[PDB]
Amino acid sequence: TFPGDTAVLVLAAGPGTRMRSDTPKVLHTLAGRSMLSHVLHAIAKLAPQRLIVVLGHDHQRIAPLVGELADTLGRTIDVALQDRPLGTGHAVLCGLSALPDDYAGNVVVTSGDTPLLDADTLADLIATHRAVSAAVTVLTTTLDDPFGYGRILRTQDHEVMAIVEQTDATPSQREIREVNAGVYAFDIAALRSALSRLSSNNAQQELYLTDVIAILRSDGQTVHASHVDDSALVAGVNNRVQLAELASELNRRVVAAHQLAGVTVVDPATTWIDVDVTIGRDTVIHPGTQLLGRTQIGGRCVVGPDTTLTDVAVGDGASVVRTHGSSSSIGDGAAVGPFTYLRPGTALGADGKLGAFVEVKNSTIGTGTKVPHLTYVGDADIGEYSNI
Amino acid sequence: TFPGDTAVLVLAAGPGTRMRSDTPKVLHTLAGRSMLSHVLHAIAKLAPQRLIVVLGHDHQRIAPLVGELADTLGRTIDVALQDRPLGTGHAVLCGLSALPDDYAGNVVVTSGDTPLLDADTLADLIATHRAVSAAVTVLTTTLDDPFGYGRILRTQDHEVMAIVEQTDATPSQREIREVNAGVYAFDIAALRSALSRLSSNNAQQELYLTDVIAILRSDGQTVHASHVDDSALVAGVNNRVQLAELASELNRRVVAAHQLAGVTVVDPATTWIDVDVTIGRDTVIHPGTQLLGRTQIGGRCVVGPDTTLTDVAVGDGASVVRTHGSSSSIGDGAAVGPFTYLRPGTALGADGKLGAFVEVKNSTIGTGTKVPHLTYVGDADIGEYSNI
Amino acid sequence: TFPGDTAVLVLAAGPGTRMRSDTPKVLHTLAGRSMLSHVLHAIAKLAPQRLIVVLGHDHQRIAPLVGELADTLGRTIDVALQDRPLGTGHAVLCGLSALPDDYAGNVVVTSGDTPLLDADTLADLIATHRAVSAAVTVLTTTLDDPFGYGRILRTQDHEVMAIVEQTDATPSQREIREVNAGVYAFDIAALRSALSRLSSNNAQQELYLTDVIAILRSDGQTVHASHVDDSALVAGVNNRVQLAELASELNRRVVAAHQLAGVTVVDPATTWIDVDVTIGRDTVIHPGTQLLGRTQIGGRCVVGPDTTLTDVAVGDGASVVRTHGSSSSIGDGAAVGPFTYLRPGTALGADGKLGAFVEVKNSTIGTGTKVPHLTYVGDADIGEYSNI
Numbered sequence A, B, C: 001t002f003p004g005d006t007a008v009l010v011l012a013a014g015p016g017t018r019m020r021s022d023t024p025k026v027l028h029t030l031a032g033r034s035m036l037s038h039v040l041h042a043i044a045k046l047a048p049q050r051l052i053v054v055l056g057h058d059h060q061r062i063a064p065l066v067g068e069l070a071d072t073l074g075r076t077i078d079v080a081l082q083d084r085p086l087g088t089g090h091a092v093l094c095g096l097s098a099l100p101d102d103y104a105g106n107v108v109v110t111s112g113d114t115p116l117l118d119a120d121t122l123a124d125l126i127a128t129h130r131a132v133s134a135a136v137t138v139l140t141t142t143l144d145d146p147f148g149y150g151r152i153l154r155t156q157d158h159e160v161m162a163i164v165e166q167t168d169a170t171p172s173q174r175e176i177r178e179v180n181a182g183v184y185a186f187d188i189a190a191l192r193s194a195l196s197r198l199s200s201n202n203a204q205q206e207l208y209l210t211d212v213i214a215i216l217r218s219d220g221q222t223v224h225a226s227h228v229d230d231s232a233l234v235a236g237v238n239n240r241v242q243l244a245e246l247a248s249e250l251n252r253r254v255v256a257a258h259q260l261a262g263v264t265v266v267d268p269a270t271t272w273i274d275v276d277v278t279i280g281r282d283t284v285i286h287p288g289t290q291l292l293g294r295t296q297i298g299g300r301c302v303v304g305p306d307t308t309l310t311d312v313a314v315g316d317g318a319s320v321v322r323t324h325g326s327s328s329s330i331g332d333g334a335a336v337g338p339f340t341y342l343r344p345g346t347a348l349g350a351d352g353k354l355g356a357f358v359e360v361k362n363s364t365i366g367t368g369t370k371v372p373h374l375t376y377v378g379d380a381d382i383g384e385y386s387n388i
């Protein structure tokens, strides 16, 4: 977590055009959270002294949610509005408009569309920054395909010189594969000063935040880039292709953590587990399964195949097979499926049975009660050990 | 599209033994089209002056379909029959039997089993061929595993010498990884001449089309090979293993195009979209979904998970979840699924509901009509805003 | 298969802690067999003169099954019990306690958690061992990630010196990527002698079997390591992450063999086929399908999508779509699904139909009998060509 007097700016003002969506980019959803929700969670964990989200384009619709999140995380989150889209640098300049004019602390600039960004990466950033006592630290990474991203230019001694954006690069600089991750740490005084000197001269007619690296190099200040090996943690999201690739890479990591904690997952590539889901030891998840939202599964269960559960509580030793359910509970040792539909409000007691072609809506089903097949049970209370 | 006086021969005469199937190889199906259908579509788009499909082995069963396709593409397609399987070169010689004896135009020889072959690749071929004013241009590619394919031999100056087939290669030439793609462009006069000189001497006792590259090299004519980086576009299909790998690579590209045009696809690896399918902006497709045939999905929909739709029209803002349907329409704002079965003839109006364990056959269901669960509706007309 | 007087020790005494499971590691299940079942099958095929499984930790629960397997494979399998977990070397020393004190034959030491280990790999091992007339042969492999495994140390002439375990390695030796596979072949006399000299001095305070390679090198005896290119065949299983990766790699190979023998499998990554399953020519398996246990599918069938069948017999030309069934038979030309549930005891004759939302339990359904939708048929006999 964070030394000491630290302020983090989350930049979320972009137009998000390439998503091709009426829903603002950062609100696009991923393993149970919006990209923005992930990024604010990761950041809050470190507990900066300040947390500033720069909203732009769609602030109207994003703002409410930041405050919604601000409460959840029991912490204050500031919102700065960038008026004109006059570039990422201007965005930072807007961010700063929300700290006192003489905040002495370090500044960490990150983005709203890097949902994989984690605690360690961020920490390491400050550790390096303070250690090498840098005026700026920028996180980089090496990609197989560097299109869209800005390129890190280095002389022979591996020393940083400047960052040149996709649009502005020569065709030879496009062959460069080391990219700007868009996560920074700044000496605050050394930042303000550098932003004052940015020109919109070339070539998206804009004020580039990247331009700062070359300015400060010329200033005579110490300019460190820190290479992040695991690109995933630092990858951005501009289109729905990247959104899916990252949804995939995060899922893989969520499943792995469950596997390493005692859950058999027969097919990780087709088992989808949202971030809040809990699962007990020696549970088996068969292929084609989504466990979404607040779903908790106990130990020694069998879930799947083809099972989707949103906000479902599942006891120990239950079996939930080919079921589509939500906002329900399933008791210890209960048997549900195949081809069962649990609508919200279904509470099925321990060792209850819900068989094939059974739909339950808003019903309490007592301990040991069987509903064997082809039945709708809606808005009803059923006693224990009965038979429907 | 095609300069100018151009004739393309599609070779589809092979025995297709390794498919191990009673259905001829090129008729094997892939994202809604037979390999042959893909290849004739790609080719027709460029509009050669002539289009000749060389049929052999199974011509009896393939021919009808070429003429079926010939109509669809509003264009004439010629069929040459190769009698004996006396080699790929003989096949070309058969192809030519369908042009006038003095056709002056260039000849493009491609194959029936390269379903990924696209417009640009083909164009580039002629552009290179005419530019370097070649007697022959052959397309190559580099593979991780070059088994089965023929090897490109090059001296130190990267200059082509000959092509040596899987069977005939030394074991050291098998270490070579650059392969013959089996797509060519020829100077017509320089082709005829070279084929006359082919011998069946070694080692599948046959007349190899590949043999031409070495002959023309000796002739003193200009022999260019053009390396294709994206192997996929140029990969062939000899067994069902390759068929699936290519079905996969094409799917990935179909999904990506949808993603980049505003469709959220949660899991591309398990979402299958045939080539004709249309999908509207901000639709979400959940995992385990096949959209097959002429299926069109509007905007702001939710399809999936576990949904298969063949030739289904789906309005804007409909939800189609765990449904198996075909030859049906689903109205704007309609709710179908989970566990719903739409047989051909189902027409469900705007804001209609078809609930769990409901099967509809050949029925009109009017606007706002609910069928909540566990019901068969067959051969019926139901009024608007009614309740079943 | 095996020369001549050969004895194989299968080591299965580990604590298996990293599985994090109440079920002993080697009993963890994989494509229809426990890891131990796979390994004993592969080994029995070669027909060693002796077969010794060293049980430790959980012998109580594993032993019965070895004898269960011993019968199936019509062959005797010996069980040696290792008392204290005093290391892998001690385990071997325990293994030997079950051969006569003067068994002259070669000894092959393999592990219980390498379920992919095949016939050829094993053969090649002895072929090399006898050919180079080695005192020990160890199988190695190169990994992208060598964590957990023991490292092969080689001087400049590629000659083996010693094997250093994960725990005991310097941080520079951890950069080494060539790993000990834990499959060996020994000259028996040269083994006994070397084990006598093992010390528990460093650093898991234990008797390492690996230590033998360095001892025998010093002895002056001939020490060969044989690199296995296909790591999969030789990969071990310590956690559920590896279990799934291997379940995946084996599946891929099972599907490929079916594809190459005439079965169309649209999506191999999401089609799961246990090892005993048979499938006929020109069958098509659609995505999301599991064929488990003793399931046999005839030719020209259609299975899937979303179909799970455990121990189901399926005739020629049947269609089994969106079905969840087990211990049942489905006749030639029969139509089952979508959303059909076959419980054990279901026998559906040729050209029978079981339609949507139909569950069958323990019933005989005669030739040409239809059960069109939304029906339970339990414990019943139905005549031919009838209608339910």
Ligand SMILES: CC(=O)N[C@H]1[C@@H](OP(=O)(O)O)O[C@H](CO)[C@@H](O)[C@@H]1O
Pocket: A014, A088, A089, A148, A149, A150, A151, A163, A165, A179, A180, A181, A182, A208, A209, A210, A235, A236, A237
């Ligand atoms: C001018 C600027 O700040 N460009 C950054 C920024 O790109 P945008 O395309 O403006 O989002 O973030 C990228 C990381 O996702 C990084 O590659 C790039 O250099």
Ligand SMILES: CC(=O)N[C@H]1[C@@H](OP(=O)(O)O)O[C@H](CO)[C@@H](O)[C@@H]1O
Pocket: B014, B088, B089, B148, B149, B150, B151, B163, B165, B179, B180, B181, B182, B208, B209, B210, B235, B236, B237
């Ligand atoms: C004699 C001949 O023309 N061989 C060609 C041809 O192989 P066949 O195995 O005959 O289909 O097409 C291949 C491309 O799929 C290419 O590798 C090869 O060189």
Ligand SMILES: CC(=O)N[C@H]1[C@@H](OP(=O)(O)O)O[C@H](CO)[C@@H](O)[C@@H]1O
Pocket: C014, C088, C089, C148, C149, C150, C151, C163, C165, C179, C180, C181, C182, C208, C209, C210, C235, C236, C237
């Ligand atoms: C002391 C010893 O025998 N270690 C072996 C053995 O490891 P364990 O972690 O003890 O299972 O098997 C491994 C192969 O899975 C191999 O890498 C290693 O060198």
